Symmetry: C3
Subunit: 150 residues, 3 copies
């Protein structure tokens, strides 16, 4: 009883502060970035969205996305799975991930009831290439390993 | 004896019905989509191709791609591995994955001799960005966990 | 004690021989490709970079990149983890991966102290689409499974 899960998300961004879909303040990993706007239906959290998708995929299931991340916590418990670890990559020209990394990791640890040592997070630029390189978009690939209790 | 596998595929598409490589009726997850054409050597199944690649990668190995997926089934048995689960992401503006999801999942379950509950499949748009966002391409990332028998 | 790790890298390339960042001879998987230049700070090894990132992510940690790959070897031993396997995808119009695949696999086996049978490597083109399809870039997605000793 070991399972892999995988998730992906992309949103269009703009470098302004902000002032179906509209341009709002970026949220990423539950962390506001008041200097970037995001085009989204929801809060447009590429990290929480792709991570939530990773955890449901691990279990062969399908605006504030902290809500989704807490439900995933309850679904994992209902289905008898524990997280071994999760590993997250943001591909983004901006924002830099390093300054807010400890915070995001804390937001994810917390919300899923795991330790900070079960969460890895890394930012890569797109080397100024394509929509992501030109600051038009951000994406996230998230991976989860799950273990059947117990 | 636990192994990760990973695979990737991209093909150029056009929104027409169709009428080395040529434009044909799209196949995705073994499911025809008569309203999209695909540029391919083979049937151009981004799902079966990346999934087959995931399962060989799991095992450190290298026109109808259902054929490849059945051989992978025999190679896994020859090499003494079972699939724990597989998790698949299609990144495509079109086609929508939801309408054909149950069918694809059935085609994959069947062909590999696993249950529908060991297969996860999810569609994401590319938020209208780049060749994929403009309906010029579709891609797929596939993940596999394997377990040594027995 | 089983862990997933994931890594990603992209660099701008040019098809010339070459004669913060500058254009140099491409290195990929520790293998020089004297017919392609790479834009990089370091040697610009998309494979060693993303693989190193995969192995640290597996462990919830953060110019010659063979050096990074050897440290990862020591960090894994210090943290009491063994590699089950690694699976690598290069997405590149050029170079072809097949000719240099055995060599790269040998460079990775060697440097991490695992067998060639624990390493999978695969090249995909980007079907001539976008910066990667136009030979402006190359990328790599790397996956690792780790197992607690012992
Ligand atoms: Zn989203
Ligand atoms: Zn193909
Ligand atoms: Zn690099």
């Amino acid at each position: 009883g070991v399972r892999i899960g995988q998730g992906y998300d992309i949103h269009q961004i703009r470098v302004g502060p902000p002032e179906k879909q509209s341009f709002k303040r970026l949220t990423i990993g539950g962390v506001p970035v008041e200097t970037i706007s995001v085009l989204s239906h929801s809060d447009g959290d590429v990290i929480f969205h792709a991570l939530v998708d990773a955890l449901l995929g691990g279990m062969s299931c399908s605006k504030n996305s902290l809500s989704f991340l807490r439900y995933a916590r309850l679904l994992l418990y209902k289905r008898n799975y524990a997280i071994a670890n999760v590993d997250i990559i943001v591909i983004a020209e901006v924002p830099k991930i390093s300054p807010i990394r400890e915070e995001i990791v804390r937001n994810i640890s917390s919300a899923l009831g795991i330790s900070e040592s079960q969460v890895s997070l890394k930012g890569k630029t797109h080397e100024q290439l394509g929509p992501v390189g030109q600051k038009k978009a951000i994406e996230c690939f998230a991976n989860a390993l799950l273990i059947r209790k117990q």
